[PDB]
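> Could you send the hepatocyte growth factor prediction when you get a chance?

Sure thing. Input:
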Amino acid sequence: VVNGIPTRTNIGWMVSLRYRNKHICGGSLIKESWVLTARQCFPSRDLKDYEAWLGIHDVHGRGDEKCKQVLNVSQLVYGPEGSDLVLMKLARPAVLDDFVSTIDLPNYGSTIPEKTSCSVYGWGYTGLINYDGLLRVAHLYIMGNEKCSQLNESEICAGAEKIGSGPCEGDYGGPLVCEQHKMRMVLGVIVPGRGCAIPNRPGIFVRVAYYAKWIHKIILTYKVPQS
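Output:
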């Protein structure tokens, strides 16, 4: 995240997808054993290359010495066509506690109104000379889909007003979270696209509400030989 700030403490539903012993993406823990994330987060199709760190604040888990849970990835289900989503199934369940929790998903078709306040979180690119490692957040407002103009219904358009801030490489897969019904929900999944923290150039996020059925169909179903 570029032009964001550190979080006071760690965010329970945030996952660091590691590839080859190193952060590459964020994800959202949507069940004790499922993480909603992005396609661009998997250079290879072989599972032995991945881990999921939960309950961390630091990217290397430095102060999280007792908070953190490291889980292997047993499966990988891919989303429809131009969705870019992937659900990682975790090897053994995540232990919910004070540091790890899950975030709710919206209802199949929820329309988020414009000028609504939203947050992105990530350990990705910051532009700092020496990034401290801490999870960072930036604030964005939902905008009309026409402002993102590079199909459309699966997408959300959110940006900051005038200042250039937002997610970048390493933040892919993480959530765009807002306040819809009673509490916090993963409304969007961060995907690369419209540059990185360009002023008056809002980001396009995959609309979770569009693939909401699919996410549910998958969260309650057997393994089945993938690939």
